[PDB]
Design a protein around this ligand. Structure first.
Ligand SMILES: [Mg+2]
Ligand SMILES: [Mg+2]
Ligand SMILES: [Mg+2]
Ligand SMILES: [Mg+2]
Ligand SMILES: [Mg+2]
Ligand SMILES: [Mg+2]
Ligand SMILES: [Mg+2]
Ligand SMILES: [Mg+2]
Ligand SMILES: [Zn+2]
Lengths: 82, 100, 145, 141, 143, 117, 53
RNA sequence: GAGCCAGCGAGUCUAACCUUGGCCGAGAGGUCUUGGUAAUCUUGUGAAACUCCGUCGUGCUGGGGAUAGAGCAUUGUAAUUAUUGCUCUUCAACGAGGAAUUCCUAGUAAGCGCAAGUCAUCAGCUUGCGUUGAUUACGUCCCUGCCCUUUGUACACACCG
């Protein structure tokens, strides 16, 4: 059963699924000093899912942490309040 | 009275001078008329393989048939209606009259 | 808008119908790990149980998931329209079932055994392991085993 | 009667007929305003003819465009050509020829297909391939 | 100036009019709702389960306002999509007939749409009187 | 228990009717008796009654030869041996009660399985 | 006996045949002319079908 | 979920084809009427890709839907080696593919559907038609073919001589 490929796996990190106190103030304290805020940066620096990233993004934009540039679906583009 | 002449041939040049001779013979008898409405020409296409067997390169072939259809609407007492359709019948051109 | 502190009751694993359902996903997609329930059915039970479908599997209350499993195991008594069940109008009992987890595997072997026991054509095709739905076999499924 | 002209813009199969008459200045596309044309990106494409010449030449005329045929992005290009030609036709008939030429030049400098229809037509499909140029597959063994 | 249904974006007017439906609470929703999936080509039932009859009703209300008359056969073609036929190529497949016929019956009850001569359903003058009024209401929201 | 075909047991079904058996039949069998009143069942069933009498108990009857393999196994034929034509031969099959709602064709294979060796 | 020529011929390839050569294969049923594909190609010019493109 | 736009075409009478609209049904379908021998009616063939808002959140995963089990319908004299359609369930390989190799120069390639042909039923096929629409080149004989010139020939059913 020769296959003529190699087929190595990957590391498959465990990004957080429900949000708790240690994640909550961590997003509260470091969404400033982010020049550009989106779903994918929040996944990479905070280890939360796209679910949490999209809902938290909606959360901040009414109360005040991040300013919007563009509110198109599947791509949210956010800047800092200086 | 509202009679209507409809032409449905495939030969365009036979059809036209048939249609022209209807409308010109109308005007010696001075009848008001809807001048010929030309409906969209409809093409009957048949796409077959050239070969009788199934060998060779797959060359197809499209035979088509164009049908031209015109109608002229006329209002006339009976004697002109008997005269106009009795003459100017050209072979391969189909003429039929409907009233109202 | 709604951020919510999840608490210490949460479960990374849960057991319904003898299967280790993983947590950390939405409840309807999570219960599809249990055999005999697929995405359509899973939506209807959690709808008929009046649970918030937005929740993850690991955070749902103890009474709610036992309420869910009752609606799965007695479906048509709780107003499921019963052409929605998989094994309806059954060959011995006459009544509409809905096999779950092990029943699906065990009852599938049994009705195979009838066709093998009466020597019906489909049963003999299963005993050889070949196709039974009238497929061509001259090229496809070549390295099946 | 009332000063009015009638133009059309085209694209691959889309045709948009435009009635340009003298009015108060509203520019409607299929009974709906010009700001409602659904594909959000190319809406900013249909603003550009009036955005080129300035909105001042659209105060005293009102525009109706009726759109049929083709597809979504083809319908957009037929709309913009119809209003650009309709404006240049209005200044041809009523206003002097000076206003026509400054109108025409600004259009024709920016994009030539605002006034001239694109002549690119579909190429017939040929037996032996899925397309007009493509063939299906040659195999030798 | 006489604002109308044509003068407002399709999305937000349908959303606003459907919310008018949810508050009014008088629609005669069928009863098989949240069990059906509303198209034979569809793969799931509507994710927004607690409405979507009100969404569909607002959607169908604007269509008779635009057009002259519709039937239920037209609406199934409009709301149908491509059915992924497994390993075969896709195909247009019509939507669930009951869903269109019932909401058209349901809109008859509130008095928006009526029967038409020459067949089909026509917007009544009650329908042509309140759809404008939400259209006035929904278009000053951003102003 | 003994076999109850979809909740109806042997004490009714061995002689209840052909016609109420189709009330409990699946779609295909209901469709078959929805349309079609030919005398091809008629002649076969009368010869079925003949073969039952000439057998006593502790005799399985004589195998009745048929061509038609599209005849649904009705509960009237339960307990007989039928020679089904598979294209060149007549195959011996006993009609069980558990082979109800099937055609005769499913039990006389039309091909000889390949071996490659 | 009555059993001769008794199988139905209401639909299928057995119901139709070329009006010229009584063949079953390659029939052309468009526009109701019902001539086989090799016989139509021999008769297309005098029926009125021509090649243009 | 919401928006929402083509073109090529086919269609019954001494037959029952294209089917609008109303009603029943989750569906596939059933039933009552109607229009059409057709630029008139199906039919704006409201096609799909697409567009806007939402759930998913790198997981062989809500990717993929093969292979199996139960029912409900439709065509047909008949559907078992499941005709086809619908529902529910089961939910495999496959993580972009070695040596090899095909087609192509602008409304073209490629994506995406629809009609027609075969057709009682059945399209993953073909013939056409539209929809969305690139990159690259505007060369050369390097490879592979074909043609020509010069040349040698003891060949001429002609180098398989
Ligand atoms: Mg060959
Ligand atoms: Mg109206
Ligand atoms: Mg079409
Ligand atoms: Mg399986
Ligand atoms: Mg190479
Ligand atoms: Mg393609
Ligand atoms: Mg030499
Ligand atoms: Mg020699
Ligand atoms: Zn012939």
């Amino acid at each position: 059963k020769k296959k003529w490929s190699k087929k190595s796996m990957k590391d498959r990190a465990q990004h957080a699924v429900i949000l708790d106190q240690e994640k909550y103030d961590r997003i509260l304290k470091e969404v400033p000093t982010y020049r550009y805020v989106s779903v994918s940066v929040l996944v990479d620096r905070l280890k939360i899912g796209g679910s949490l990233a999209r809902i938290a993004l909606r959360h901040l934009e009414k109360e005040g942490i991040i300013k919007p540039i563009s509110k198109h679906s599947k791509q949210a583009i956010y800047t800092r309040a200086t | 009275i509202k009679i209507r002449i409809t032409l449905t041939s495939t030969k365009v040049k036979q059809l036209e001078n048939v249609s022209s001779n209807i409308v010109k013979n109308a005007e010696q008898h001075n009848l008001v008329k809807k001048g010929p409405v030309r409906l969209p020409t409809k093409v009957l296409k048949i796409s077959t393989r050239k070969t009788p067997n199934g060998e060779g390169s797959k060359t197809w072939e499209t035979y088509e048939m164009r049908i031209h259809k015109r109608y002229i609407d006329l209002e006339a007492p009976v004697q002109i209606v008997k005269r106009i359709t009795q003459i100017t019948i050209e072979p391969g051109v189909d003429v039929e009259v409907v009233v109202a | 808008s709604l951020v919510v502190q999840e608490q210490g009751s949460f479960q990374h694993i849960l057991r319904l119908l003898n299967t280790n359902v993983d947590g950390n996903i939405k409840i309807v997609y999570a219960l599809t790990t249990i055999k005999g329930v697929g995405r359509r059915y899973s939506n209807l039970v959690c709808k008929k149980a009046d649970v918030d479908l937005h929740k993850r599997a690991g955070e749902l209350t103890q009474e709610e998931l036992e309420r869910i499993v009752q609606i799965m195991q007695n479906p048509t008594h709780y107003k499921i329209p019963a052409w929605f069940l998989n094994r309806q109008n059954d060959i011995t009992d006459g009544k509409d079932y809905h096999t779950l987890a092990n029943n699906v595997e065990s009852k599938l072997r049994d009705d195979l055994e009838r066709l093998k026991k009466i020597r019906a054509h489909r049963g003999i095709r299963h005993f050889w392991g070949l196709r039974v739905r009238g497929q061509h076999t001259k090229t496809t499924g070549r390295r099946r085993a | 009667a009332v000063p009015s002209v009638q133009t059309f813009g085209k694209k691959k199969s889309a045709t948009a007929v435009a009635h340009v008459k003298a009015g108060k200045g509203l520019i409607k596309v299929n009974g709906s305003p010009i700001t409602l044309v659904e594909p959000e990106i190319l809406r900013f494409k249909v603003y550009e003819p009036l955005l080129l010449v300035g909105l001042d030449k659209f105060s005293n005329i009102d525009i109706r465009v009726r759109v049929t045929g083709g597809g979504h992005v083809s319908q957009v290009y037929a709309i913009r050509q119809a209003i650009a030609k309709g404006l240049v036709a209005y200044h041809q008939k009523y206003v002097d020829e000076q206003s026509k030429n400054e109108l025409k030049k600004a259009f024709t400098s920016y994009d030539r297909t605002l006034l001239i229809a694109d002549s690119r037509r579909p190429e017939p499909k040929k037996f032996g391939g899925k397309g007009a140029r493509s063939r299906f597959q040659k195999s030798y063994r | 100036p006489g604002v109308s249904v044509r003068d407002v974006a399709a999305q937000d007017f349908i959303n606003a009019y459907a919310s008018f439906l949810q508050r009014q609470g008088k629609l005669e929703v069928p009863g098989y709702v949240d069990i059906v999936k509303t198209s034979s080509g569809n793969e799931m039932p509507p994710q927004d389960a607690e409405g979507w009859f009100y969404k569909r009703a607002a959607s169908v209300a604007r269509h008779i306002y635009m057009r002259k008359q519709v039937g239920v056969g037209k609406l199934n073609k409009l709301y149908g999509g491509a059915k992924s036929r497994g390993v075969r190529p896709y195909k247009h497949i019509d939507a669930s007939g009951s869903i269109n016929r019932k909401v058209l019956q349901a809109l008859e009850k509130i008095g928006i749409v009526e029967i038409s001569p020459k067949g089909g359903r026509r917007i009544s003058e009650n329908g042509q009187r309140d759809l404008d009024r939400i259209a006035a209401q929904t278009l000053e929201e951003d102003e | 228990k003994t076999h109850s075909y979809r909740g109806v047991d042997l004490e009714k079904l061995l002689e209840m009717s052909t016609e109420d058996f189709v009330k409990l039949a699946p779609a295909r069998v209901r469709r078959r008796f929805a349309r079609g009143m030919t005398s091809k069942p008629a002649g076969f069933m009368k010869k079925l009654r003949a073969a039952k009498l000439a057998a006593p108990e502790n005799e399985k009857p004589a195998p009745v030869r048929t061509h038609m393999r599209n005849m649904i196994i009705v509960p009237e034929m339960i307990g007989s041996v039928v020679g089904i034509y598979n294209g060149k031969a007549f195959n011996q099959v006993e009609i069980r009660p558990e082979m109800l709602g099937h055609y005769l064709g499913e039990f006389s294979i039309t091909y000889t399985p390949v071996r490659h060796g | 006996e009555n059993v001769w020529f008794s199988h139905p011929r209401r639909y299928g390839k057995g119901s139709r045949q070329c009006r010229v050569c009584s063949s079953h294969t390659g029939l052309i049923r468009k526009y109701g002319l019902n001539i086989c594909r090799q016989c139509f190609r021999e008769k297309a010019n005098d029926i009125g079908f021509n090649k243009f493109r």
